Amino acid sequence: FLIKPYEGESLSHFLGRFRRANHLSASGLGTLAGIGAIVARWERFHFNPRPSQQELEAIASVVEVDAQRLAQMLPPAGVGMQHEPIRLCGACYAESPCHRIEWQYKSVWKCDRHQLKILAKCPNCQAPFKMPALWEDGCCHRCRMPFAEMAKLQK
Amino acid sequence: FLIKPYEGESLSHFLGRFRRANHLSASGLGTLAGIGAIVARWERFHFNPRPSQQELEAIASVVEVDAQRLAQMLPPAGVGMQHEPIRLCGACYAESPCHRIEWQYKSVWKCDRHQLKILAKCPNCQAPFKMPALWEDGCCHRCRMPFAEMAKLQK
Amino acid sequence: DDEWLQAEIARLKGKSIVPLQQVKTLHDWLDGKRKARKSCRVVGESRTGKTVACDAYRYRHKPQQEAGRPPTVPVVYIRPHQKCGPKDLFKKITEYLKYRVTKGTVSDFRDRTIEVLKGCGVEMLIIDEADRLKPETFADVRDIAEDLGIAVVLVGTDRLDAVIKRDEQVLERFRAHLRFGKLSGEDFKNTVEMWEQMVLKLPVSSNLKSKEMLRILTSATEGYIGRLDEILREAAIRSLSRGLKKIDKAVLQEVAKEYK
Amino acid sequence: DDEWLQAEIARLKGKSIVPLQQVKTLHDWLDGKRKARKSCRVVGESRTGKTVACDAYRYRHKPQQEAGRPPTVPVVYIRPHQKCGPKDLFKKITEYLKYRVTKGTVSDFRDRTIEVLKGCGVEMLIIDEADRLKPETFADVRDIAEDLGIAVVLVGTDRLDAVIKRDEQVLERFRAHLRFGKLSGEDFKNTVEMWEQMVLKLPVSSNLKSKEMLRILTSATEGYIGRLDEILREAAIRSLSRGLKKIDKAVLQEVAKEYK
Amino acid sequence: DDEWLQAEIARLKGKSIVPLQQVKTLHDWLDGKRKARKSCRVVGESRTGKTVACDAYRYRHKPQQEAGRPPTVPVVYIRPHQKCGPKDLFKKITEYLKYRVTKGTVSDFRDRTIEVLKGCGVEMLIIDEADRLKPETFADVRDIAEDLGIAVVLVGTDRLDAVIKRDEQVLERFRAHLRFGKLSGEDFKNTVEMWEQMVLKLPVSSNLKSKEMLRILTSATEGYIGRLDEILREAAIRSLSRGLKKIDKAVLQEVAKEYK
DNA sequence: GATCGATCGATCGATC
DNA sequence: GATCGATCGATCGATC
Numbered sequence A, B: 001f002l003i004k005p006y007e008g009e010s011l012s013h014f015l016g017r018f019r020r021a022n023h024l025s026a027s028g029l030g031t032l033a034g035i036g037a038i039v040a041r042w043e044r045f046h047f048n049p050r051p052s053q054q055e056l057e058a059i060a061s062v063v064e065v066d067a068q069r070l071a072q073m074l075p076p077a078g079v080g081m082q083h084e085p086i087r088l089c090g091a092c093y094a095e096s097p098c099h100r101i102e103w104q105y106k107s108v109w110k111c112d113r114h115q116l117k118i119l120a121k122c123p124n125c126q127a128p129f130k131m132p133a134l135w136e137d138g139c140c141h142r143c144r145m146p147f148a149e150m151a152k153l154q155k
Numbered sequence C, D, E: 001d002d003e004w005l006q007a008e009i010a011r012l013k014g015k016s017i018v019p020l021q022q023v024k025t026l027h028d029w030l031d032g033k034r035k036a037r038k039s040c041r042v043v044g045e046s047r048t049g050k051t052v053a054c055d056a057y058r059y060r061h062k063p064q065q066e067a068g069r070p071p072t073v074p075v076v077y078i079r080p081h082q083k084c085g086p087k088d089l090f091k092k093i094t095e096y097l098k099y100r101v102t103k104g105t106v107s108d109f110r111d112r113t114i115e116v117l118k119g120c121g122v123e124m125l126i127i128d129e130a131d132r133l134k135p136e137t138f139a140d141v142r143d144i145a146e147d148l149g150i151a152v153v154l155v156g157t158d159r160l161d162a163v164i165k166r167d168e169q170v171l172e173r174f175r176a177h178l179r180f181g182k183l184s185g186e187d188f189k190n191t192v193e194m195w196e197q198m199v200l201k202l203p204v205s206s207n208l209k210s211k212e213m214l215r216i217l218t219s220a221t222e223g224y225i226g227r228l229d230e231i232l233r234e235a236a237i238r239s240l241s242r243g244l245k246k247i248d249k250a251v252l253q254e255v256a257k258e259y260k
Numbered sequence F, G: 001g002a003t004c005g006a007t008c009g010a011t012c013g014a015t016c
Ligand SMILES: Nc1ncnc2c1ncn2[C@@H]1O[C@H](COP(=O)(O)OP(=O)(O)OP(=O)(O)O)[C@@H](O)[C@H]1O
Pocket: C015, C016, C017, C018, C019, C020, C023, C044, C045, C046, C047, C048, C049, C050, C051, C052, C053, C156, C157, C225, C226, C227, C229, C230, E169
């Protein structure tokens, strides 16, 4: 089962969404692509050894999304990002149910489209968000508040 | 029948001692507390999923020992422990008949109070000690040597 | 006419909810327990109609959501799967409230479920098939009902009573019950006629549920609402498949002997 | 007419309940014992009509069930099988009340039966064929009647009296009895005529149960209601099979000689 | 000729599917249950031919796949192994649909199986040898039939009925059945002759299934289709191995005494 | 989870 | 009319 990426979707979110569509573990996707543990590293936003051309093309062969498009699920060259905290604009999620790579940019604190501060934890119960690959439903894993409803609590 | 914890008593030892005072199986205590199989997991020192606040408060409601005191029957945060081997200071047991959670700390090999190596099996017959919840009497289950007498064989 | 036949068979395949006195008593009792946060346990036979009635009590209080605050869900309905652990149950609780889970330990799931459970102002925790979950989870549901003050209704077959009996606290805390009746009597005949009018939705051929039909259906269903539904739907579909406009005697005889 | 003949033979095959003075005395006595929770033992001959009368006393108090509480069953009727053990008897008690059993020990069955027996507010425990169950179960029925305060009626042939006589407590505790009569006399003739009017349900051919017919039926039945029913039904079916509209003398002679 | 002999023995070793009235009734009933999503349980004897008929009902609806969407599989046929757990069953479900599994917990397998089961639009869940799987998995199959609306057919020997009887819900929900017949009669003779024409595929030597042959085969097979197939194939192979062009009396006598 | 584990429960039948 | 002795057969129940 193939999936079309959402605009701005992060690599972690896309990988997990592909895995859920195919009932794959991270190790299973890694074996399908021939790169093993690299998949789980990318899902946790760990890129000490940045994604190589061969690794991106290996994943591209499985998910049928070109390496160039996969690179747009990561920050451009020179744009610093953070693996933690995982962040969210609930108003964006209501429009398109994905984590955006921009929300991990170190320079980003406000959603430009919605002119709201982005969230660094659930505004109802304060639970931090899991890595985007594990965003199985669109709700806080603790209190079960929908990400879309968190828009109403954004400042 | 309620019991006051001994200082330093491990959670496994305390749970089993409460069960013996009330003729309860581990499953029976679990049903009384509303948490089922979790009781037996804790008795065998299995906490991959660490005790939650709700689980500790559920047991606290039955045994009438606050969750904060129950947490002192487990290692503090950051202190690694082992489920195996179950260990014993016989000189300590002679003074207070309980298994101490400190004896399962990975860093502990000597009793500070008695300046003796702690035991990892019966020093008379080499039988390993059962999980502390099953320490029904104070004696080796095989050769029947009292734990208090094992102090004389500690090095 | 073939399109009409396909519509008829599709409608007959789909089940409906006829509101009768059994479900009326049930949600009256449920409202009574809800207004006092009294945790009870509705019990009954198998294939008798408890799940549908609890479902109706769930949809009647459809959560009304504020513009920018979490939707307030007064009644929570869950049917945990076989050997449902505590993590699975908490996942289900926070999933029904539309809060997707985050990977973590059992404590993390418990904390998130408690947070979202107080956040939405839940009044009822309806655990259908409450004979499936492990007894290490009954402590968790006990803690929920104890601290969060949510009336929990444990729904299941009579085996649920045996499951809770071997435990100590869950039996005492959950003692109020509402056994589902067999429905046999004149009320059963009223049920047959009301079903004929509503669920069958066939042209009026004056079947009227005659004495012979009542005897056949009594011998067939043995009082079960589910068996009545299955037999009626099977007879209607078999009559419509063979071109018969109404339901004849041969089809009831065939379905009755096929059952027993 | 062939369909009518099939209807007639089917109706004649099926037995009915004509209410006569025997069953009237019986349920009057049963109501008297029920209002005081007095455990008695109705005894009588074989093929005389005790089971049908106890059955009638069972159906007259058809349990009326509340909307959401267990149906209250005032009269419990059981006919345990040959060599019925305590587990089997308890299974039957809780099965009649429509509580399906759960696998377990004899103690578990006893506890569940006691629970459901106090739950439904039972007043009567009618044990028909009470000469079948083992004497290790009479202690259980004694305990039921002792603690739960339920009037138990032990029904069976005269062999039941011999079975209970060798025991000590069951004989003293269950001493009140109601022997079923032979019915011979003018009341027997009234029975024949009433049977002709109701059960035979044949067109009025002025048979009127003449003296010869009364003599034949007296020689045949020897006072038994069951023999009377069997002979009447056999004669009616034989007359209807050979085309005879009414019942002739030859068919009674044939059925009488076939019996004796 | 030796190559022809090898071809003949290879063909005789391989089994075929002769369509007869038993399988005709079976897939007619299966289509009837499929059009209404009615979950039933076909039961029968051992070595009687239920697996082959369910297999035929599986292949007749060979899934037709779209150019770029999952193949739509209307009928799912499974034969779980001995003591099949829930994880194993889910693995089999998602493996038949050609979705290779991913390592994970039982919940992950359940979620993936549910996803692929709604994705392919499955109509039937044929669980052959349904007496093998554990009773902790009957809750899972119950949930499948309850929520996904898929008519489940539990296939197995009469021991399957005993296995489901001790359970509560699976017995009530799965009550419609189709017992496989013994086939003895003139239809049995028709079966023998039809088998001779098709499956044996031997030159016409006018055997015609004479009375003596019918008596021998009746004494041998006892009505079983599988025994008939085995005896016929063994006799044909034994005749072809010893040079006999057709099947003699001695070979049937030998195979019959070798069986009984 | 089978696997014993008595066990007692008729029973019956000759027979003296 | 006791009586004595063999016999086999479900059967629930603990138990390791
Ligand atoms: N109020 C109702 N209106 C219409 N159908 C009903 C109603 N109640 C029950 N049914 C019918 O009962 C059947 C299933 O009932 P339900 O699932 O509620 O059973 P249950 O009592 O919860 O039992 P189980 O535990 O065995 O599943 C279906 O055929 C359904 O149509």
